[PDB]
Structures are given as C-alpha cells and as structure tokens.
Design a protein around this motif. Structure first.
Motif, PDB file in Angstrom:
ATOM      1  N   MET A  49       0.789  -1.216   0.000  1.00  0.00           N
ATOM      2  CA  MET A  49       0.000   0.000   0.000  1.00  0.00           C
ATOM      3  C   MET A  49       0.829   1.278   0.000  1.00  0.00           C
ATOM      4  O   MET A  49       0.534   2.219  -0.734  1.00  0.00           O
ATOM      5  CB  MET A  49      -0.946  -0.024   1.224  1.00  0.00           C
ATOM      6  CG  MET A  49      -1.940   1.146   1.302  1.00  0.00           C
ATOM      7  SD  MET A  49      -3.290   0.903   2.504  1.00  0.00           S
ATOM      8  CE  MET A  49      -2.296   0.740   4.010  1.00  0.00           C
ATOM      9  N   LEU A  50       1.915   1.339   0.800  1.00  0.00           N
ATOM     10  CA  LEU A  50       2.844   2.459   0.814  1.00  0.00           C
ATOM     11  C   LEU A  50       3.560   2.664  -0.514  1.00  0.00           C
ATOM     12  O   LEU A  50       3.640   3.771  -1.043  1.00  0.00           O
ATOM     13  CB  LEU A  50       3.851   2.285   1.977  1.00  0.00           C
ATOM     14  CG  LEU A  50       4.859   3.437   2.186  1.00  0.00           C
ATOM     15  CD1 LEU A  50       4.189   4.814   2.324  1.00  0.00           C
ATOM     16  CD2 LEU A  50       5.719   3.158   3.429  1.00  0.00           C
ATOM     17  N   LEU A  52       2.347   1.430  -3.468  1.00  0.00           N
ATOM     18  CA  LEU A  52       1.239   1.766  -4.352  1.00  0.00           C
ATOM     19  C   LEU A  52       0.818   3.233  -4.285  1.00  0.00           C
ATOM     20  O   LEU A  52       0.572   3.880  -5.304  1.00  0.00           O
ATOM     21  CB  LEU A  52       0.019   0.866  -4.019  1.00  0.00           C
ATOM     22  CG  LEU A  52      -1.195   0.974  -4.967  1.00  0.00           C
ATOM     23  CD1 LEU A  52      -0.856   0.521  -6.395  1.00  0.00           C
ATOM     24  CD2 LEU A  52      -2.373   0.150  -4.419  1.00  0.00           C
ATOM     25  N   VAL A  53       0.731   3.829  -3.079  1.00  0.00           N
ATOM     26  CA  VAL A  53       0.442   5.247  -2.930  1.00  0.00           C
ATOM     27  C   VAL A  53       1.578   6.156  -3.420  1.00  0.00           C
ATOM     28  O   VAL A  53       1.324   7.179  -4.058  1.00  0.00           O
ATOM     29  CB  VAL A  53      -0.120   5.596  -1.554  1.00  0.00           C
ATOM     30  CG1 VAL A  53       0.973   5.790  -0.491  1.00  0.00           C
ATOM     31  CG2 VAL A  53      -1.021   6.841  -1.667  1.00  0.00           C
ATOM     32  N   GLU A  54       2.867   5.788  -3.208  1.00  0.00           N
ATOM     33  CA  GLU A  54       4.001   6.484  -3.816  1.00  0.00           C
ATOM     34  C   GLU A  54       4.006   6.405  -5.347  1.00  0.00           C
ATOM     35  O   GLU A  54       4.187   7.408  -6.035  1.00  0.00           O
ATOM     36  CB  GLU A  54       5.364   5.996  -3.253  1.00  0.00           C
ATOM     37  CG  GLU A  54       6.559   6.861  -3.742  1.00  0.00           C
ATOM     38  CD  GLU A  54       7.894   6.500  -3.117  1.00  0.00           C
ATOM     39  OE1 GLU A  54       8.074   6.673  -1.884  1.00  0.00           O
ATOM     40  OE2 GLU A  54       8.830   6.113  -3.872  1.00  0.00           O
ATOM     41  N   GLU A  55       3.716   5.216  -5.922  1.00  0.00           N
ATOM     42  CA  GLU A  55       3.538   4.990  -7.353  1.00  0.00           C
ATOM     43  C   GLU A  55       2.423   5.858  -7.937  1.00  0.00           C
ATOM     44  O   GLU A  55       2.539   6.462  -9.004  1.00  0.00           O
ATOM     45  CB  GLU A  55       3.172   3.495  -7.571  1.00  0.00           C
ATOM     46  CG  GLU A  55       3.093   3.017  -9.041  1.00  0.00           C
ATOM     47  CD  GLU A  55       4.442   2.587  -9.585  1.00  0.00           C
ATOM     48  OE1 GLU A  55       5.345   3.441  -9.751  1.00  0.00           O
ATOM     49  OE2 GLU A  55       4.597   1.369  -9.874  1.00  0.00           O
ATOM     50  N   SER A  56       1.307   5.979  -7.191  1.00  0.00           N
ATOM     51  CA  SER A  56       0.193   6.869  -7.496  1.00  0.00           C
ATOM     52  C   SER A  56       0.578   8.338  -7.503  1.00  0.00           C
ATOM     53  O   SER A  56       0.172   9.084  -8.390  1.00  0.00           O
ATOM     54  CB  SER A  56      -0.998   6.701  -6.521  1.00  0.00           C
ATOM     55  OG  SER A  56      -1.428   5.341  -6.484  1.00  0.00           O
TER      56      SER A  56
END
Lengths: 156, 74, 72, 69, 77
Positions: free
Chosen positions: E26-27, E29-33
């Motif tokens: 999730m961390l 994935l949110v940085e990738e986002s």
C-alpha cells in the motif's frame, strides 16, 4: 542500430548528437539529418517527423518533437532540445526516439525507433557513454532504425 | 507514531503505525493535488471554447473572403 | 470489554479495504494518464494543420496586398 | 484514556473524498475529448479553406492585372 | 486445553504478517500513485504550453486577416 532487423526491411539511418555537462546537470540533444527512410504510403510521398521521449528505468516522463519535413525520405532538421538531469539521476534514465509519417487520417504507425541509455549494446551504448563522459561534445553519430517489438525485446 | 490503537509492543506493530502514517500523509497530499488538477483542467477545458470560437470565426471569415474574392472573378 | 484478537483481525480487515480504496484511485490515474497522453497525440494533428494554415494565410494576405496595389 | 482509531477512520475518509473528486474529473476528461473531437474537424476545414483562399488570391492578382492594363 | 490461548496467538501472528505485506504494498502503491500524479500534472501544464501557441497562431491569422479585410472591402470598385 544496424545489427537489428531494420537493415533487412530498410527502415533508414538517423544522425544525432548527444551532449551533457555533469557539473551543471544540463542535457542537450540535437537531431541533425536522416537518410534513406522507408516510405509508408503506397502512392503518396511521406512527410517524416520525430518524437523523443525521456524515461526513468523504462518509466515514461515527458516528450518533445521535431518540426515536420514534408515530401522526403532524407529529412534535414538540425533541431535542439535541452533538459536538466542531476548527476546521481543520469545513471537511472533512458531516451527513446521514434520516427513517424504524417497522414491526416490518423492511427499513424511508426517508421521505426531506437533508444539510448542503459539496457543497450554497441552504438547506442557508446553514444550514451560518450555523452556522459565529455562536457559540451559537438560530435554526432548515425543510428539505423529498428522495428518496435525488437526494441521492446532488447530493452526488457 | 500514534496513528492506530496499539495492541502489542512488537516491532511489527511499530512498523505498522509508521507505514500507515506515511500512507495517510501521501493521501492528504493527493487530495490537494486532485483539487489543483481539477481547477487547472476545468480552466483549460473552457479555454478550448475560446480557441474554438476564434477558429470557427476565422474559418467563416476565410469562407467570406474566398466567396468575396471568387465573386470578383469573371 | 476490549479484546486483542478481535481488534487486530478487524483492523487487518479495514486495512485490506483501505488498500482496495487506493487501488480504485490508482486504476483511475492509470486510465486518465493514458487518455490525456493519447489526446496529446491528437493535438499534434490539430497544431500542424493550424500551422500549415498559417503558412497559407501568410502567403495569401501577402499576395492579396500585392494584387490590390495595381488599382490606380 | 487508551489510544483510539479516529485517525485510521480519517485515512479512509481522505481516500473516499478524493475518489468523489476524481470521478467528476474523469467526466471532465470526456468533456475535453468531445471538444477536441469537434476542434479536429474545424482544423481540416480551416486548412482546406486556407488553400482555396490562396489559390483564389492568385486568380484575383491575375484578374486585377488585366483590369488596370 | 488448546483453544484457551495457543491457537489465538498464531492466528494473530499470521494476520499481523499479512498486514505488514498489505501496508508495505500500500505504501509503495500510494508512492507509485503520486509519481503518476506528478507526471499527469506536469503533462497537463505542458499541454497548456502547447495550447497558448495554438491561440498565438489564431492571433496571427486575425492580425493579417484584419489588414486583408480592408483591402478586400476597398477592392471591388
């Protein structure tokens, strides 16, 4: 370059100059001339133009393009593009060069493409290494275009 | 660092609290980024009307000019 | 009152839901990024057709100004 | 008192709030698509009219040369 | 006996380890986002760089057509 399959299908040769300054972080790419491009339409004459995209580890960032040179297979550009890349971050990036024909109908196919940066061999690797090493280099090099899925397979 | 009801004193629980805090702050940044992006894109979309009205006006003016020039031919 | 297994198992359940909330947002960004980039390829056709029209207008107005000048 | 989970609930609310804004924003990408699609047809019409106008101007130059002779 | 404690501790341990895997995923994935977000925002501004040039071309067409309009109106005598 010409060790790919694009020599057999006669995609064409493009000449360009890469130069960097490691101390100041500024990068300049100059697209010069191309010679003996493949013609895409059957009965018309091709109008070739180049789109150049910067990437980080194969991850797309932003792109710029040349002016279009109409009715030719030997276009002369002499067009300059300048960017900023930090010294610790030039060792994380690639630059992808794609040449296309101009028809107004749309769904345009690439004539061929090539890239410079890590994950490469020969001429492509040499030009990137030479660019990094030498501040404000004026020298240029020729690269033969290759087919898209050969470039994908090579990059992987 | 205090983002959840801690049920244990484990390093695994400590990592969980910091990881959730880092995720929450990135989502809070994304919230403001989306509001900026929506403000710029709506303004840009209504800029297309401004360009399009000028484009059709000049195309129609060129049609008038082409008709006007053609009507002086004989 | 409060019980440890119930708290952690429920908390894990909400965290995996939070990951999937972020996953929908991520899917929207990837499709949006593809669409705005694809629209940017279309804008190159619009730009060149307009710039080529500017060359025809710059020539046409120049020739029109030459043409009118012969009226005495 | 013992530490409580409102901050975790807030984190879910923050993603829930941005997703609602993003759903409105993607429909405005579709608004952009429709406007660009109309603009593309106007661009060909402008280019086609510009070619006709230059050729008409060249005819007019020849005509006004004959008029004043 | 068994279900007084021993089963519960290993169930909690498995949930906690798959929770680390979700939070780390999730961390990232949110940085990738955010990385995709920042690219999208910069691309939106540089599409605005392109759009002012399109209006600049329309302004140039307007300028020379405004001169041309006078000549076309006085021409037909």
């Amino acid at each position: 370059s010409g060790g790919g399959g694009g020599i057999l299908e006669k995609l064409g040769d493009i000449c360009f100059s890469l130069r960097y300054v490691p101390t100041a972080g500024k990068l300049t790419v100059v697209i010069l001339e191309a010679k003996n491009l493949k013609k895409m339409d059957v009965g018309g004459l091709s109008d070739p133009y180049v789109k150049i995209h910067l990437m980080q580890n194969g991850k797309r960032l932003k792109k710029k393009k040349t002016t279009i040179k109409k009715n030719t297979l030997n276009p002369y550009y002499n067009e300059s593009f300048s960017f900023e890349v930090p010294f610790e971050q030039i060792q994380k990036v690639q630059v992808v060069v794609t040449v296309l024909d101009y028809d107004k109908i749309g769904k345009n196919d690439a004539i061929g493409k090539v890239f410079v940066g890590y994950n490469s061999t020969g001429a492509e690797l040499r030009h990137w290494s030479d660019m990094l090493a030498n501040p404000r280099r004026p020298i240029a090099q020729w690269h033969t275009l290759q087919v898209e899925e050969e470039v994908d397979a090579m990059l992987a | 660092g205090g983002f959840i009801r801690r049920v244990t004193n484990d390093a695994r629980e400590n990592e969980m609290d910091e990881n959730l805090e880092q995720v929450s702050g990135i989502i809070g940044n994304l919230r403001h980024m989306a509001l900026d992006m929506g403000n710029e894109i709506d303004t840009q979309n209504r800029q297309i009307d401004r360009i399009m009205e000028k484009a059709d006006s000049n195309k129609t003016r060129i049609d008038e000019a082409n008709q006007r020039a053609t009507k002086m031919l004989g | 009152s409060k019980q440890a297994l119930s708290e952690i198992e429920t908390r894990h359940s909400e965290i995996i839901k939070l990951e999937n909330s972020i996953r929908e947002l991520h899917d929207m960004f990837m499709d949006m990024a593809m669409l705005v980039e694809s629209q940017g390829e279309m804008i190159d056709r619009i730009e060149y057709n307009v710039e080529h029209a500017v060359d025809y207008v710059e020539r046409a107005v120049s020739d029109t100004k030459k043409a009118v000048k012969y009226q005495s | 008192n013992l530490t409580s989970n409102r901050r975790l609930q807030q984190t879910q609310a923050q993603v829930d709030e941005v997703v609602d804004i993003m759903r409105v924003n993607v429909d405005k990408v579709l608004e952009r698509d429709q406007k660009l699609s109309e603009l593309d047809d106007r661009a060909d019409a402008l280019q086609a009219g510009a070619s006709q106008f230059e050729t008409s101007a060249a005819k007019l130059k020849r005509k006004y040369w004959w008029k004043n002779l | 006996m068994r279900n007084e404690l021993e089963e519960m501790q290993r169930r909690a341990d498995q949930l906690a380890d798959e929770s680390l895997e979700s939070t780390r995923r999730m961390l990232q994935l949110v940085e990738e986002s955010k990385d995709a977000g920042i690219r999208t925002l910069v691309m939106l501004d540089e599409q605005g760089e392109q759009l002012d040039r399109v209006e600049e071309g329309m302004n140039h067409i307007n300028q020379d057509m405004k001169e041309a309009e006078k000549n076309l109106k006085d021409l037909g005598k």
